[PDB]
Symmetry: C3
Subunit: 602 residues, 3 copies
């Protein structure tokens, strides 16, 4: 009639306790807890053996674990098939918990790390804090094929946060999404030599990363998000060496030396990421500071990039860096077949080194850019440049040895195509472009604020020599419009029916031009002879001019007209973009940097 103590305390004693359902308390045990196997959970007492017994019971009986205290442990723990919800694991700093086919939510991994060994693992709403192991979440030498969803976790205070080394059985599919990774000393997400993995997709999306500083650490530590296939680099190496079909989308990477990195990737997309590189972090690791660094990649797109560098522009403005690989220091594996678009990074610069050959196609597309320096090396079989707004262009087509990565390695004698449409090189009043070695068979160019010169690599080798006419103008008057630079081939049609054809691109300044005396520091010039408010002796802003003897130590000053003709103090006046250095005397001549030659028909 009464309850016996030894029956109530037995392993079936809970069956003696009724519940509102009409069932009993034994039927309510849908979980176990570590404390039932001897765990103290005070974060100090060594609970390793209790955790091991909990895992064995959970595995043996296929029952989930619930926990809420803090289990100090001091040697490796191996979990397989476990569902674990809640609690904190506290290691010695870098103590390992391995997982095969485990599902873990709401857990904190303090001063320890998880190593995934395979199966379908799922990690949601966990915290990985203060690991002193190489990585806080490691995939390495998996013993069975895996899939992974690693989402809505927070990671901080560690070295590497997420690290994969591709040796062993493959991860066939993985999603790394919506994680918050911050204040770390290695890489945030690094998937290294994983070319055999992710046949059914690698997606790294909407992760928020902040403060990645590997200063004092080893070589190449400190990347934000990195994905790497396997060398050797080379234009014709097998597809199987590359990591393929992956996507890096919607991530935010703040205060990191090299925010996004791919090497030996193929058929991938880097889409709509926001990056803030900083030269001041990860000092000594050898990484090129930038937002996106791609080495030896093929068949890829970069679409959508915002941000700027946190350091002063005098240290670096490099944001996009696309380069050849290197095998034992020798350039190899030019980037080919790629599309770069929607880079809204006006403070920051783009540096691309590519190539082109008769032995393989390389088609490049660059579109919808807003950047600082646009620097380019290499001459693809076809290259298009559309709606690029930049502050300067530094461009060599078939670059040679000493002119950038892989210079001199490949040439293309067959049909080579280029297009420039709707681009703008402008920094205030200055149009600053440099083009060379563009050995094209056809180059379409229209709508730009500059001309693109093309060149011939041996007589006859690019067909008949032609100059594209990119500018034509109508004037109501007959005199040649003064003070304005026109490219070679420009045609001016007059209302009278006369026509001017520019045979040497440049601007017209009369031989009778005279200016007033100038003093050091002056940024305006005034006419002492000609009517600068006439069309024939006009002065257009943006035109490059030379003021004899006004530069350093009586050299010639090359500058740009900053403001077109105006009258002040009863004198025709222009502003210049650079100050007088050496004073000049009354009735000095000004002239064009590039003096025009034209012929007039009728």
């Amino acid at each position: 009639s009464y309850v016996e103590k030894n029956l109530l305390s037995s392993t079936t004693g809970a069956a003696m306790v009724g519940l509102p359902s009409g069932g009993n308390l034994l039927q309510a045990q849908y979980f176990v807890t570590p404390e039932q196997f001897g765990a103290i959970g005070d974060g100090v007492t060594d609970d390793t053996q209790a955790i091991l017994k909990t895992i064995t019971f959970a595995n043996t009986n296929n029952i989930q674990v619930r926990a809420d205290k803090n289990y100090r442990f001091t040697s490796s723990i191996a979990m397989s098939g476990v569902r674990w919800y809640g609690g904190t694991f506290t290691g010695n700093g870098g103590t390992m918990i391995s997982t095969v086919s485990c599902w873990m939510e709401n857990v904190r991994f303090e001063k320890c790390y998880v190593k995934m060994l395979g199966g379908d693992c799922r990690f949601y709403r966990n915290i990985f804090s203060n690991a002193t192991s190489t990585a806080a979440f490691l995939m390495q030498a998996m013993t069975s094929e895996g899939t992974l969803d690693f989402s809505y976790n927070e990671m901080y205070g560690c070295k590497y946060a997420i690290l994969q080394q591709g040796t062993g059985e493959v991860m066939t599919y993985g999603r790394y999404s919506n994680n918050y990774i911050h204040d770390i000393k290695g890489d945030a997400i690094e998937l290294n030599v994983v070319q055999k993995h992710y046949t059914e997709g690698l997606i790294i999306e909407n992760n928020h990363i902040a403060n990645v500083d590997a200063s004092g650490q080893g070589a190449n530590w400190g990347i934000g998000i990195g994905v790497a296939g396997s060398g050797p680099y080379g234009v014709d190496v097998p597809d199987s060496q590359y990591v393929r079909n992956f996507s890096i989308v919607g991530n935010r990477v703040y205060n990191c030396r090299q925010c996004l990195h791919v090497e030996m990737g193929k058929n991938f997309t880097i889409r709509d990421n926001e990056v803030y590189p900083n030269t001041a972090v990860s000092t000594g690791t050898g990484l090129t500071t930038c937002g996106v660094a791609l080495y030896g990649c093929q068949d890829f797109e970069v679409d959508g990039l915002t941000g700027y560098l946190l350091n002063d522009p005098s240290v670096s403005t490099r944001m996009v860096f696309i380069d050849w690989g290197v095998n034992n220091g020798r350039y190899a594996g030019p980037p080919i077949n790629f599309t770069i678009k929607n880079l809204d990074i006006p403070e920051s610069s783009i540096e691309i080194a590519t190539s082109g050959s008769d032995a393989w196609e390389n088609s490049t597309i660059v579109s919808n850019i807003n950047c600082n320096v646009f620097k380019w090396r290499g001459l693809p079989s076809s290259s298009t440049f559309n709606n690029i707004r930049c502050r300067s262009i530094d461009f060599i087509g078939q670059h040679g040895s000493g002119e950038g990565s892989g210079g001199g390695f490949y040439t293309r004698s067959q049909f080579t195509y280029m297009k420039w449409v709707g681009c703008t090189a402008l920094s205030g009043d200055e149009t600053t472009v440099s083009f060379a070695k563009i050995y094209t068979d056809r180059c379409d160019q229209v709508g730009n604020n500059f001309g693109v010169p093309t060149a011939v690599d041996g007589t006859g080798h690019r067909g008949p020599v032609l100059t594209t006419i990119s500018e034509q103008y109508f004037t109501a008057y007959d005199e040649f419009p003064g003070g304005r630079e026109f490219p070679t081939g420009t045609v001016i049609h007059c209302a009278s029916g006369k026509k001017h054809v520019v045979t040497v691109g440049g601007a017209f300044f009369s031989d009778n031009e005279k200016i007033k005396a100038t003093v050091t520091g002056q940024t305006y010039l005034q006419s002492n002879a000609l009517n600068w408010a006439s069309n024939g002796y006009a002065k257009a802003a943006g035109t490059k001019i030379v003021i004899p003897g006004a530069g350093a130590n009586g050299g010639d000053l090359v500058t740009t007209i900053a403001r077109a003709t105006y009258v002040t103090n009863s004198l025709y006046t222009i502003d210049i973009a650079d100050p007088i250095v050496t004073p000049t005397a009354e009735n000095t001549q000004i002239k064009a940097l590039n003096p025009v030659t034209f012929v007039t028909v009728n």
Copy 2:
């Protein structure tokens, strides 16, 4: 040998009950519940004191709370460090629960609100229903710095859903993602005067908002998603006044008066949002109806917008509104250094007011647009317009007082650049554009279906006067092609070697043109003299013409040719875009709106 009642009912009595693990029931208590502290949970009985005792025990012993009933409470509850899973809190309407460093999942907050006071707070899969407080989730006067993940929650029936006021300690990082907010009477997500916050990122992403109607509420209530820095507005005010580096991405805002709002923002992106504004909601609050409203912002991008307004187009079609700020009613802080792209809103209109000066750069980019009215005021130092498809253009460059926000405030005498490439202004058969006060030093334009006129602000002030030749044509015949509008400077090259140069843009209609009598309502005209199927007397659709006396009260009818020459009833025939109003008699003349002048060479 038997179990004593007073031992079993003691605080350690559960240790007497064995479980299958070999442990005991005391070791299975990984949580507490409010009912253990006296809560009834019937949604009616006042459970405030029980909740307070639960929170104290959870804090004191660092133990999570589990709950599943409905706890009525009637005064403020303050939580710190709590993990709470499940249950409903029911207040009096606007009763407060404050949280510092709390983690809450699967909770319903009914007729109450949560105020975050700091720490790392995390809110997932909760419901915030029927709050009558100002906000359902409030961040205000935090006492410690915070981070927030507020994701996959549902909010409805309230006034403001999410509201931050920036006074107090800062939120260093926050993610507001994948929430569902609907049927509210204030703003859905409003982060106000938060310029000091979010140094490590503000991300508002993939939220779905529906039915925001603040009718009858106070001024500026009813914004969908709003972010605000601090005034005063001004082009040169310190960066520290602006909310910076944030992103508003992938959100859907349906049936809201002003879907997305930023003021005093800098270095931000508004990307891939879908918006359905409605003039009929939030009546009386003073908000400008639109999808995106930006005031006094700098260094920003709007990229990717879809949707349309739910009201009739006769009320409004305004979708994108980018404007100066106002300080005590005076315009201040022009939007500068911005990029607007990928707006696929063909029914809806864009209104932008900007500026340009010698004292600072302003570079604007507008690209890849599909809209209704394109309305623009202001003359940046550089502005590019590319692949804009619109139904009309309403454009003033250096707008003066009375021509829009900040008109007359700033001018730029230095080099001013503009580009129009590949744009289309078309509404059926009509090309409707208006441009004025474009005081540019250089304007590149190509590939448009209209010409852009530029102007001179004082003789000589923009260099030699030139007309860009945007159209050249070849004809196999010598006669000037009739009935088609050509801009000034157009060149026609004939197979014979003759050339025509258009010195006054317009179309050719012979002085001998005669039409048949017309009646009111007629939308075709027929020739009574000339062969409209000849090239010299041709009739091109899209050309603007004048029919003397055919308009209202015998005024001239200005219309557009809707269909080029065809024969019906044995007569040359064209269609017109507007009906005859006043009948016209046989042998009335038709003429161009803009009569051409050209010269012929040879």
Copy 3:
């Protein structure tokens, strides 16, 4: 003084057991479990009646269910208002669980399916495995209006994964996000005849789908993501027949016959999806292999597509397929008012069939494309084509019967506009385009590597006959530049003031051209007469030429110059793109495919 067994085992017996809080164990029962109602949970014993009793108790008492074992069940179970966390349900293969207003997390549905009947249902972090029912998650004939969040679930081994049939009460809002669906035999996400649904939004986002193979299954089985309104198709059918305002964003669809499908959709966006179609799966179901298939849709955008087909290109390269609908085999419902952009699919092809009329507007925009074949049928009222990089163009404007879907059905006599800007048709050395029946009133074209011919549909019907001059060149020399194709109307301006006007587009090859003998397989030609390294007898790569008698069976060989003039073996040499077939003897002539005619002025 002692505990009585019958009191402890009663429904209030738990109140006798004290807990650390000072409360009792009865107050800790925040849930029930199925085992408390007789469930065995061994995956074999029939637990149907126990599950039913659990659901009744949970409903009656409004209490959540916790579970962790495996409940075999054998007939339908109906849940309403239930919160269920954990456990596995195992059916007979296709046993049904219906849900109204249910919330389910961490559940596995094995060999069974869930049918949603309405209310606010929420499904997170579940597994749907090995269903043999038609669908694993079904929405059909709902009895109350619903909303759905179906997110972070995994589904595999089934026929259809997610299926909606729109009969019954409507889903007003649904989010299907971040699911992982793989290895299935029906569609992954199919929402069929849902035009009345989703008034407040349908969002299908960030789902990862792999291996959809409906081989041997019924007609149209095997779509990845499909959304369908209701027929009949037609340009003027009511808006209420269409599914509207939905979005398909950020999804990945791998190894599926037709990855994304819409029919009878309006005002929708298909944005930033990654697709890998495969002709080898879903054999026999009648689906057109492609990444995006749209039928009879209006007012839509496709923006952002990457991927390629997994089969060999010789089977198919079709990636984007936009077509008319069909009513009982008759074409109906042309796609109108659409924007296609940012397709980075260089290996794969685009096929679009549209139309244009006087009775309705159709404005199309195609921009920023990188594709293989660009195939187009139809003549909209306005169409723009910008920055399209392709390997060939197959284009008919006003296509007739036998020239594609709906050929001959509609024509537009009113103003018809077209624009081609900045496009490139190039495959190595070949520019391969075909255009016909472009009956435009105005066509702006600039910056392309090809000319677009326009046509006249009756004398006078498109205004005066004009040829747009797309290319003008300057030469320092007077002789006509040889060996290079120039379109009709091209103007060459010489430094001397002479001018050449091309009256018949083509290339110049002198009548005195002679080549050395050739043998079968040869891919170079050598001069036996003229100096190919002169400008007048030059040889430009990309130019099409004819070698008499060198083709199959002594026919003429039409080929392309692959490499411009070079000297080897002391002979002027060019390479050709196709090998000699029939040998040719010494002093055979080579000529242009398209011989130029030009006139010289002066």
